[PDB]
Amino acid sequence: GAMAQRKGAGRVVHICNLPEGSCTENDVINLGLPFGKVTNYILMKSTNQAFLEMAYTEAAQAMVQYYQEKPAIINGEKLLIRMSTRYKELQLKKPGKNVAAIIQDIHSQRER
Prior knowledge:
Elements: E1 11-15, H1 25-32, E2 38-44, E3 49-54, H2 57-69, E4 72-74, E5 77-79, E6 81-83
Antiparallel strand pairs: 1-3, 1-6, 2-3, 4-5
């Protein structure tokens, strides 16, 4: 804990149409980042689904509005990147956010 959710809101984006073995953890995160910062992620390969956490609720909303109109593509596969209705935030029960400061993205202002 004591990490992520830079603003007191949080939103999860769920990404579908993901090929198993073709997408990496990075691709899913890197696709969300361009319009909104990602803090955390949950990968459910069993359901062929990915969940992505955004540092700012605006980040999640802004990116998805873009990706619902212009969705992101991996290896010719069109990923619908969209708001998750099931998850409000990705509650990682694993150690993370150490060393790797995902503060390489606008709306940050100084690494903390």
